[PDB]
Amino acid sequence: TIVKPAGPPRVGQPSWNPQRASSMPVNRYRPFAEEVEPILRNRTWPDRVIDRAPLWCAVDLRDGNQALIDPMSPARKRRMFDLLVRMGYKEIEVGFPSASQTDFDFVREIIEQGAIPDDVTIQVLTQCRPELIERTFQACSGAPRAIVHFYNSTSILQRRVVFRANRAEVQAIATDGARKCVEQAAKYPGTQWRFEYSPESYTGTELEYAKQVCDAVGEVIAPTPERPIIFNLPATVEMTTPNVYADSIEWMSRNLANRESVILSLHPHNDRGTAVAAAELGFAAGADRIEGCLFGNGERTGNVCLVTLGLNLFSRGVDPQIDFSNIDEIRRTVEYCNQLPVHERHPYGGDLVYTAFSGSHQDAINKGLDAMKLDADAADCDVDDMLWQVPYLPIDPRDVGRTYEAVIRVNKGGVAYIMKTDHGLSLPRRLQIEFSQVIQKVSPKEMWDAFAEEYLAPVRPLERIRQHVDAADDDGGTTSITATVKINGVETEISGSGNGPLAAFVHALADVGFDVAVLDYYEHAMSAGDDAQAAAYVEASVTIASTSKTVWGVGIAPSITTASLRAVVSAVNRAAR
Amino acid sequence: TIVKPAGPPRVGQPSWNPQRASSMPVNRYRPFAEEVEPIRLRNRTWPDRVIDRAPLWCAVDLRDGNQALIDPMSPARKRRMFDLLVRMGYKEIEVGFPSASQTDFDFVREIIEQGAIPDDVTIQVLTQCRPELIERTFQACSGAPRAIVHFYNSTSILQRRVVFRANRAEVQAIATDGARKCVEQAAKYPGTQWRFEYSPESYTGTELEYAKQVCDAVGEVIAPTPERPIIFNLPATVEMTTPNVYADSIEWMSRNLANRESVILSLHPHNDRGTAVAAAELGFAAGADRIEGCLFGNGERTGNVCLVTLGLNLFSRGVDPQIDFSNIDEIRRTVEYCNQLPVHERHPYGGDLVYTAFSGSHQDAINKGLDAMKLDADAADCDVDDMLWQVPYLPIDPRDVGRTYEAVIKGGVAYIMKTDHGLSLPRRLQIEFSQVIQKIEVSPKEMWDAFAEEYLAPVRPLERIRQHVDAADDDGGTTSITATVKINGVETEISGSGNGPLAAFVHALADVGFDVAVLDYYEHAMSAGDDAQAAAYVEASVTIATSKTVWGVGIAPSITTASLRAVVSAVNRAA
Ligand SMILES: CC(C)CC(=O)C(=O)O
Ligand SMILES: CC(C)CC(=O)C(=O)O
Ligand SMILES: CC(C)C[C@H](N)C(=O)O
Ligand SMILES: CC(C)C[C@H](N)C(=O)O
Ligand SMILES: [Zn+2]
Ligand SMILES: [Zn+2]
């Protein structure tokens, strides 16, 4: 159970701090400087602001995949690979094919099926045993180019307790691997081979030893500015604060031999919740490249989140060179592949991150939005192309395909739930959002009364009295409609044709100055039985004669056909409100 | 939808980087130094400091966390969170915004009237600067033995312009008038040890010189002393840049604020760029005294800084957080109950997966580390559980937080059908169909072939050739249908009436021995546009001349005809 800390305060603890010593076994843990080494008074990274995208490398198919409760099926691997290509990643670690037969099979498939674009380089992980390196080259046979990423653990702790080995011995593991790579590359001249070396558990390794091993590997590989080597420096375990990782990167960047022939790569994990920070400060410290995963998947606490890194650049005016314009599509694909949810509060992608619940936040957002519109109007400009200036929202949610949501509480609650339970309507999410904004400007009765005044009651400018639907009998035929409607109270007769009743009615309305451009449509039964009422919902960008507004309409009727027509009328009248 | 970046690479972009420019509208966003101001601090010292003591913690779960929930805390859940925070060792706890929320008001009353506050705990209440709101705040706190009144107003460049439409002098006056009102009210309420906190809200969007001015001026009104200090709390209301810049701003504030001996400098970072924990740790190294956050990072949007990560980050580097985390599962269970939001599988220290190793190589290394520890423990007559933790891949002994190390040794139907085929299957259909799939990994193309074979292709026993729908012109009138169908290859006419075309068609089928009792029905567009195809789904209990529960699926350019196809598909599924 939880025991309130009751030990004495620290000597010198201020009297305004009444905290007490816990009984947690702090004696079993040491500061980083004592655990590993003291690490740079003339650092420059604190004075550098990132002004370009790094070279990204996506490791979802390897570090991500091996961290899953359910590793990816062949379909899932391919869907993830295709997503990363489409987003614009050019280096993608496709697996560990020498250690994993399913990974071997996957690398063969993408090579043999021509799934790899000419500007994409696949990367494959291997440990250093020579038979594993041979299997690695074999997996990539026929690729036009590939990165062979080999590694071994170099940390003080692993050298002692895992290897029981001296510095020379652990270095030879790496340099023997490098020699084997050079030998294998010569055997496969139809592939442009490139190399990446990681001193694994780098953050548990003396910098001078990490440098010595990388330098020695480079001597074997013999890279040049035209054919560089990647030295990848992982926080295999995140051990300390990100400024210390950044100092370590700046030291490596300054001190590694033949720096002009090196692409310096970062591989941070998230044990202390600071991976994103480690990557950003590390990149400012001189790194060239960052490995991570979409939405921070990967071993234990995960690899650094590539989404957060990329949009942290976008939102400060730096092009990440990756497309995040539909973050929900990225999220849904990632959740399908990984079978792990993106958290409600995850930066940029989480369900709740574009929501405002506080009245004062909602008011300030509205004011920001209004002021942007006023400035756009004066500059004869599209508000969506102008400087984003809205309190509480770091980005326009529309720039990643999301929507600002002003959430209104119902005093189990919530608009969606009450509407379904009390009134039998399942509102599409975008309707819930639009309606809540209306409510914003509540008891169940107030919410219902507001819903009916908005969507169900209006009879101006458009009322639909009755209609004759002439549907062709054969599949693929035309449906035509003549409708009796009142336009601002004036009875008239409209006619249109289309591929169904909704299309026909939309076309009939166009002739009388309601342009209804349909964006979406949903319908459901409000109970069981073939004689149930149907509730229909239509989303439309609507322009009325004598600018366009995207709005929803709702229609309810015993005929599935008529319910959809009522939803169109509802939408038109909502656009006039 | 996702379009591969195709724009020209940047001038000077290295040849070994073949990334192309995205079409994201980056011109709508400016660097932080242009949006707000450049870094004012000279000779920073935070990069050279390693934290060696716990800060003063303040938990804001009951205010910032609570107001951010879709299902806000009931009175029972509030008390449970309050009790947890007390039992963990928190000494400052923000219990609500009582002048804005009657439920918060009642909760503050409850804990004061019940004598629920330990002698070493100070409750904290948030208020805006308006004098009636300040009055109602002191009303809520009436009878508290001690209380922090935390008043604030927005000071950012942006909010001054578009929210308040006010200048610097006017916005400073709002703060300084709120402070005067606080002093007046405190003098009217005896006995209570009143203490104050002021936040320049949206501090990260505010010029530092100006934030310093407003704070100084508020401090002049309150007149704090080293024995009765004021808290200046500097929020990253929105996390706007990298955590080193936030830390630079805190160092500058700590070095430049007046009456520094009478100031507790407090941080309140939110997580919009994923760096709240870093902002707090570097900020603390920069001279702050105090950190506001929530357990497991609840709070507006991306949340407040995680108190659990911050506390255990100290513990795992040998610094006592002065908070008990010895049973993180209990903490997590209680937080999940109170917030009704899960702790993510990968959340530092508390997530489901954070002490699991799936790699055979990692598991080997972990065992070797545990063995060397056990060896040393024997060679020293010590319990291993009290020795220095020395285990690859595991930053802490999971047992130290009441957890265990775990050496551990699916159709995608909804996603595939929606993504590749534009069908949003009803949940019960997803279930029914994934059962067909399980029986048959089946690839996406095989899944589609099976779906078509089941719901779309069958033409026996029932085939619908064509039909005439005679729809009611008037709302509430009868709709009739007559259709030409084939019943096991035999062409026949069916006809029926009902309150709509679906009811008419099922009445028509009943005459020929196909009894379709409809249980549910859904339809949606398969793309944008008024000419889009509709997909319809009908659930029914079908009896062919017994109550077989089935789904049918229909696709057509007519909303009406798609529904008729779905009825036919259900009948054929039933046979
Ligand atoms: C080769 C390394 C990058 C292995 C790894 O994932 C790590 O060290 O974190
Ligand atoms: C008074 C402030 C600390 C309000 C707040 O929650 C914030 O600025 O983040
Ligand atoms: C699917 C719908 C948006 C409309 C359909 N094309 C009809 O006219 O009935
Ligand atoms: C709501 C639906 C199940 C059917 C509706 N009664 C119709 O006949 O069109
Ligand atoms: Zn890794
Ligand atoms: Zn906050």
Side-chain angles (χ1 to χ4, degrees), chain B residues 122-123 138 141 143-149 186 189-196:
Chain B
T122 301
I123 66 172
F138 279 80
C141 291
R146 66 198 73 74
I148 293 156
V149 179
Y189 286 87
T192 299
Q193 296 307 108
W194 297 111
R195 293 177 52 190
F196 301 102

PDB file of all heavy atoms in Angstrom, chain B residues 122-123 138 141 143-149 186 189-196 227-228, unseen atoms left out:
ATOM      1  N   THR B 122      -1.405  22.275   2.340  1.00  0.00           N
ATOM      2  CA  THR B 122      -1.999  23.548   1.968  1.00  0.00           C
ATOM      3  C   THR B 122      -2.800  23.387   0.698  1.00  0.00           C
ATOM      4  O   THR B 122      -2.245  23.037  -0.346  1.00  0.00           O
ATOM      5  CB  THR B 122      -0.932  24.633   1.787  1.00  0.00           C
ATOM      6  OG1 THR B 122      -0.211  24.770   3.034  1.00  0.00           O
ATOM      7  CG2 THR B 122      -1.574  25.983   1.442  1.00  0.00           C
ATOM      8  N   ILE B 123      -4.102  23.620   0.784  1.00  0.00           N
ATOM      9  CA  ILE B 123      -4.932  23.577  -0.422  1.00  0.00           C
ATOM     10  C   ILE B 123      -4.724  24.836  -1.253  1.00  0.00           C
ATOM     11  O   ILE B 123      -4.357  25.888  -0.741  1.00  0.00           O
ATOM     12  CB  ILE B 123      -6.445  23.390  -0.121  1.00  0.00           C
ATOM     13  CG1 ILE B 123      -7.013  24.620   0.611  1.00  0.00           C
ATOM     14  CG2 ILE B 123      -6.702  22.086   0.676  1.00  0.00           C
ATOM     15  CD1 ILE B 123      -8.545  24.556   0.756  1.00  0.00           C
ATOM     16  N   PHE B 138     -12.575  33.452  -1.847  1.00  0.00           N
ATOM     17  CA  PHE B 138     -12.401  33.523  -0.388  1.00  0.00           C
ATOM     18  C   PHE B 138     -13.622  32.952   0.341  1.00  0.00           C
ATOM     19  O   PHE B 138     -13.469  32.335   1.388  1.00  0.00           O
ATOM     20  CB  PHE B 138     -12.117  34.944   0.091  1.00  0.00           C
ATOM     21  CG  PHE B 138     -10.682  35.365  -0.071  1.00  0.00           C
ATOM     22  CD1 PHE B 138     -10.209  35.779  -1.320  1.00  0.00           C
ATOM     23  CD2 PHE B 138      -9.804  35.342   1.013  1.00  0.00           C
ATOM     24  CE1 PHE B 138      -8.893  36.174  -1.481  1.00  0.00           C
ATOM     25  CE2 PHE B 138      -8.468  35.740   0.876  1.00  0.00           C
ATOM     26  CZ  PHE B 138      -8.006  36.166  -0.366  1.00  0.00           C
ATOM     27  N   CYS B 141     -13.134  29.312   0.527  1.00  0.00           N
ATOM     28  CA  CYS B 141     -12.080  28.925   1.454  1.00  0.00           C
ATOM     29  C   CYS B 141     -12.369  29.248   2.912  1.00  0.00           C
ATOM     30  O   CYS B 141     -11.545  28.967   3.758  1.00  0.00           O
ATOM     31  CB  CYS B 141     -10.749  29.555   1.050  1.00  0.00           C
ATOM     32  SG  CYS B 141     -10.156  28.818  -0.454  1.00  0.00           S
ATOM     33  N   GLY B 143     -12.835  29.407   6.613  1.00  0.00           N
ATOM     34  CA  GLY B 143     -12.495  28.394   7.610  1.00  0.00           C
ATOM     35  C   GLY B 143     -11.317  27.487   7.277  1.00  0.00           C
ATOM     36  O   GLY B 143     -10.966  26.631   8.089  1.00  0.00           O
ATOM     37  N   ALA B 144     -10.694  27.633   6.102  1.00  0.00           N
ATOM     38  CA  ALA B 144      -9.491  26.816   5.803  1.00  0.00           C
ATOM     39  C   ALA B 144      -8.403  27.168   6.841  1.00  0.00           C
ATOM     40  O   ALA B 144      -8.292  28.318   7.226  1.00  0.00           O
ATOM     41  CB  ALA B 144      -8.983  27.079   4.337  1.00  0.00           C
ATOM     42  N   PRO B 145      -7.609  26.195   7.319  1.00  0.00           N
ATOM     43  CA  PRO B 145      -6.516  26.633   8.229  1.00  0.00           C
ATOM     44  C   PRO B 145      -5.390  27.395   7.472  1.00  0.00           C
ATOM     45  O   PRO B 145      -4.711  28.254   8.034  1.00  0.00           O
ATOM     46  CB  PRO B 145      -5.976  25.307   8.781  1.00  0.00           C
ATOM     47  CG  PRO B 145      -6.358  24.291   7.788  1.00  0.00           C
ATOM     48  CD  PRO B 145      -7.672  24.721   7.201  1.00  0.00           C
ATOM     49  N   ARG B 146      -5.211  27.057   6.202  1.00  0.00           N
ATOM     50  CA  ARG B 146      -4.204  27.711   5.356  1.00  0.00           C
ATOM     51  C   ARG B 146      -4.664  27.469   3.936  1.00  0.00           C
ATOM     52  O   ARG B 146      -5.370  26.477   3.649  1.00  0.00           O
ATOM     53  CB  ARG B 146      -2.814  27.120   5.603  1.00  0.00           C
ATOM     54  CG  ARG B 146      -2.683  25.661   5.169  1.00  0.00           C
ATOM     55  CD  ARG B 146      -1.470  24.955   5.808  1.00  0.00           C
ATOM     56  NE  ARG B 146      -1.742  24.699   7.194  1.00  0.00           N
ATOM     57  CZ  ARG B 146      -2.560  23.759   7.666  1.00  0.00           C
ATOM     58  NH1 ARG B 146      -3.190  22.868   6.878  1.00  0.00           N
ATOM     59  NH2 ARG B 146      -2.711  23.701   8.967  1.00  0.00           N
ATOM     60  N   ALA B 147      -4.304  28.376   3.039  1.00  0.00           N
ATOM     61  CA  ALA B 147      -4.753  28.266   1.677  1.00  0.00           C
ATOM     62  C   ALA B 147      -3.888  29.126   0.794  1.00  0.00           C
ATOM     63  O   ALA B 147      -3.564  30.251   1.153  1.00  0.00           O
ATOM     64  CB  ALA B 147      -6.220  28.723   1.539  1.00  0.00           C
ATOM     65  N   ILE B 148      -3.589  28.606  -0.400  1.00  0.00           N
ATOM     66  CA  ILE B 148      -2.983  29.413  -1.446  1.00  0.00           C
ATOM     67  C   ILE B 148      -4.088  29.907  -2.360  1.00  0.00           C
ATOM     68  O   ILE B 148      -4.833  29.101  -2.925  1.00  0.00           O
ATOM     69  CB  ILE B 148      -1.941  28.617  -2.269  1.00  0.00           C
ATOM     70  CG1 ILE B 148      -0.729  28.249  -1.397  1.00  0.00           C
ATOM     71  CG2 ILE B 148      -1.508  29.452  -3.485  1.00  0.00           C
ATOM     72  CD1 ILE B 148       0.072  26.988  -1.916  1.00  0.00           C
ATOM     73  N   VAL B 149      -4.216  31.227  -2.487  1.00  0.00           N
ATOM     74  CA  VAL B 149      -5.090  31.812  -3.498  1.00  0.00           C
ATOM     75  C   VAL B 149      -4.202  32.138  -4.705  1.00  0.00           C
ATOM     76  O   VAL B 149      -3.233  32.905  -4.615  1.00  0.00           O
ATOM     77  CB  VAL B 149      -5.876  33.047  -2.943  1.00  0.00           C
ATOM     78  CG1 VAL B 149      -6.780  33.674  -4.016  1.00  0.00           C
ATOM     79  CG2 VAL B 149      -6.717  32.595  -1.745  1.00  0.00           C
ATOM     80  N   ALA B 186      -8.171  39.059   2.337  1.00  0.00           N
ATOM     81  CA  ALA B 186      -7.437  38.299   3.361  1.00  0.00           C
ATOM     82  C   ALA B 186      -7.570  38.972   4.705  1.00  0.00           C
ATOM     83  O   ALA B 186      -7.680  38.288   5.730  1.00  0.00           O
ATOM     84  CB  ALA B 186      -5.928  38.103   2.993  1.00  0.00           C
ATOM     85  N   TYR B 189     -10.813  37.961   6.478  1.00  0.00           N
ATOM     86  CA  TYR B 189     -11.024  36.576   6.871  1.00  0.00           C
ATOM     87  C   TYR B 189      -9.948  36.144   7.848  1.00  0.00           C
ATOM     88  O   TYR B 189      -8.875  35.697   7.450  1.00  0.00           O
ATOM     89  CB  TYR B 189     -11.027  35.671   5.662  1.00  0.00           C
ATOM     90  CG  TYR B 189     -12.272  35.742   4.812  1.00  0.00           C
ATOM     91  CD1 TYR B 189     -12.394  36.691   3.791  1.00  0.00           C
ATOM     92  CD2 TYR B 189     -13.326  34.840   5.016  1.00  0.00           C
ATOM     93  CE1 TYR B 189     -13.537  36.724   2.968  1.00  0.00           C
ATOM     94  CE2 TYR B 189     -14.476  34.869   4.220  1.00  0.00           C
ATOM     95  CZ  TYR B 189     -14.584  35.827   3.202  1.00  0.00           C
ATOM     96  OH  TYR B 189     -15.729  35.854   2.409  1.00  0.00           O
ATOM     97  N   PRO B 190     -10.243  36.258   9.151  1.00  0.00           N
ATOM     98  CA  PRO B 190      -9.184  36.011  10.139  1.00  0.00           C
ATOM     99  C   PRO B 190      -8.843  34.531  10.309  1.00  0.00           C
ATOM    100  O   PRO B 190      -9.600  33.641   9.837  1.00  0.00           O
ATOM    101  CB  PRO B 190      -9.783  36.581  11.439  1.00  0.00           C
ATOM    102  CG  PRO B 190     -11.278  36.434  11.260  1.00  0.00           C
ATOM    103  CD  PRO B 190     -11.488  36.771   9.769  1.00  0.00           C
ATOM    104  N   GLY B 191      -7.708  34.276  10.965  1.00  0.00           N
ATOM    105  CA  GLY B 191      -7.352  32.928  11.375  1.00  0.00           C
ATOM    106  C   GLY B 191      -6.662  32.148  10.257  1.00  0.00           C
ATOM    107  O   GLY B 191      -5.576  31.630  10.454  1.00  0.00           O
ATOM    108  N   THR B 192      -7.279  32.107   9.078  1.00  0.00           N
ATOM    109  CA  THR B 192      -6.686  31.396   7.932  1.00  0.00           C
ATOM    110  C   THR B 192      -5.317  31.969   7.592  1.00  0.00           C
ATOM    111  O   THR B 192      -5.168  33.199   7.520  1.00  0.00           O
ATOM    112  CB  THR B 192      -7.616  31.467   6.729  1.00  0.00           C
ATOM    113  OG1 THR B 192      -8.856  30.838   7.076  1.00  0.00           O
ATOM    114  CG2 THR B 192      -6.999  30.763   5.507  1.00  0.00           C
ATOM    115  N   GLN B 193      -4.320  31.093   7.377  1.00  0.00           N
ATOM    116  CA  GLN B 193      -3.000  31.578   6.898  1.00  0.00           C
ATOM    117  C   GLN B 193      -3.079  31.686   5.385  1.00  0.00           C
ATOM    118  O   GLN B 193      -2.902  30.704   4.684  1.00  0.00           O
ATOM    119  CB  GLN B 193      -1.853  30.626   7.293  1.00  0.00           C
ATOM    120  CG  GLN B 193      -1.641  30.503   8.785  1.00  0.00           C
ATOM    121  CD  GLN B 193      -1.469  31.863   9.458  1.00  0.00           C
ATOM    122  OE1 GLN B 193      -2.363  32.331  10.177  1.00  0.00           O
ATOM    123  NE2 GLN B 193      -0.341  32.522   9.196  1.00  0.00           N
ATOM    124  N   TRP B 194      -3.374  32.886   4.903  1.00  0.00           N
ATOM    125  CA  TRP B 194      -3.543  33.130   3.485  1.00  0.00           C
ATOM    126  C   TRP B 194      -2.186  33.285   2.831  1.00  0.00           C
ATOM    127  O   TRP B 194      -1.303  33.977   3.323  1.00  0.00           O
ATOM    128  CB  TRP B 194      -4.365  34.410   3.262  1.00  0.00           C
ATOM    129  CG  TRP B 194      -5.769  34.348   3.791  1.00  0.00           C
ATOM    130  CD1 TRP B 194      -6.281  35.050   4.866  1.00  0.00           C
ATOM    131  CD2 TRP B 194      -6.862  33.580   3.255  1.00  0.00           C
ATOM    132  NE1 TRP B 194      -7.603  34.727   5.040  1.00  0.00           N
ATOM    133  CE2 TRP B 194      -7.989  33.833   4.074  1.00  0.00           C
ATOM    134  CE3 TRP B 194      -6.984  32.659   2.194  1.00  0.00           C
ATOM    135  CZ2 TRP B 194      -9.248  33.227   3.844  1.00  0.00           C
ATOM    136  CZ3 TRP B 194      -8.251  32.066   1.945  1.00  0.00           C
ATOM    137  CH2 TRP B 194      -9.363  32.359   2.774  1.00  0.00           C
ATOM    138  N   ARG B 195      -2.014  32.636   1.693  1.00  0.00           N
ATOM    139  CA  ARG B 195      -0.779  32.794   0.937  1.00  0.00           C
ATOM    140  C   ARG B 195      -1.180  32.983  -0.518  1.00  0.00           C
ATOM    141  O   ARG B 195      -2.280  32.602  -0.898  1.00  0.00           O
ATOM    142  CB  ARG B 195       0.040  31.530   1.024  1.00  0.00           C
ATOM    143  CG  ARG B 195       0.596  31.194   2.394  1.00  0.00           C
ATOM    144  CD  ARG B 195       1.307  29.867   2.259  1.00  0.00           C
ATOM    145  NE  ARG B 195       2.258  29.902   1.156  1.00  0.00           N
ATOM    146  CZ  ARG B 195       2.886  28.833   0.689  1.00  0.00           C
ATOM    147  NH1 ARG B 195       2.657  27.637   1.248  1.00  0.00           N
ATOM    148  NH2 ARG B 195       3.741  28.972  -0.316  1.00  0.00           N
ATOM    149  N   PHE B 196      -0.281  33.530  -1.334  1.00  0.00           N
ATOM    150  CA  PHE B 196      -0.672  33.895  -2.700  1.00  0.00           C
ATOM    151  C   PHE B 196       0.234  33.328  -3.727  1.00  0.00           C
ATOM    152  O   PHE B 196       1.424  33.079  -3.475  1.00  0.00           O
ATOM    153  CB  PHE B 196      -0.797  35.432  -2.855  1.00  0.00           C
ATOM    154  CG  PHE B 196      -1.812  36.009  -1.914  1.00  0.00           C
ATOM    155  CD1 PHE B 196      -1.418  36.648  -0.749  1.00  0.00           C
ATOM    156  CD2 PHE B 196      -3.172  35.802  -2.142  1.00  0.00           C
ATOM    157  CE1 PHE B 196      -2.394  37.125   0.173  1.00  0.00           C
ATOM    158  CE2 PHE B 196      -4.132  36.261  -1.240  1.00  0.00           C
ATOM    159  CZ  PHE B 196      -3.734  36.925  -0.080  1.00  0.00           C
ATOM    160  N   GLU B 227       9.745  34.834   5.257  1.00  0.00           N
ATOM    161  CA  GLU B 227       8.862  34.014   6.092  1.00  0.00           C
ATOM    162  C   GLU B 227       7.457  33.811   5.452  1.00  0.00           C
ATOM    163  O   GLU B 227       6.827  32.782   5.678  1.00  0.00           O
ATOM    164  CB  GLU B 227       8.768  34.616   7.509  1.00  0.00           C
ATOM    165  N   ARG B 228       6.966  34.786   4.671  1.00  0.00           N
ATOM    166  CA  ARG B 228       5.673  34.660   3.983  1.00  0.00           C
ATOM    167  C   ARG B 228       5.882  34.910   2.476  1.00  0.00           C
ATOM    168  O   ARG B 228       5.498  35.943   1.975  1.00  0.00           O
ATOM    169  CB  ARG B 228       4.623  35.643   4.565  1.00  0.00           C
TER     170      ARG B 228
END
